[PDB]
Structure 1
Amino acid sequence: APECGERASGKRCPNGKCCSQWGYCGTTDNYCGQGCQSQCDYWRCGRDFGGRLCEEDMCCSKYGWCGYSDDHCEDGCQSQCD
Structure 2
Amino acid sequence: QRCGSQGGGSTCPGLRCCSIWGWCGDSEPYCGRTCENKCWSGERSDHRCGAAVGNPPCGQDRCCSVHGWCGGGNDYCSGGNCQYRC
Alignment partners' CA distance in 1, 2:29 and 2:17:
9
Indicate if the aligned counterparts of 1:44 and 1:65 stay in contact, CA closer than 8 A.
Answer: no
- CA shift, 1:23, in A, is 1.1
Instruction: Give a deviation string over 1:5-34, Cα, whole Å, max 9, x none.
Output: 101221110010000111111111111000
Regions of 4+ moved over 6 Å: none
Alignment partners' CA distance in 2, 1:66 and 1:29:
17
Indicate if the aligned counterparts of 1:16 and 1:42 stay in contact, CA closer than 8 A.
Answer: no
CA RMSD of aligned residues (A): 3.5
Higher strand share: 2
Structure 2: which 5+ runs fail to align? 51-63, 76-80
Percent of aligned pairs with the same residue?
A: 32
Q: TM-score, normalised by structure 1?
A: 0.55
Q: TM-score, normalised by structure 2?
A: 0.53
Structure 1: which 5+ runs fail to align? 74-79
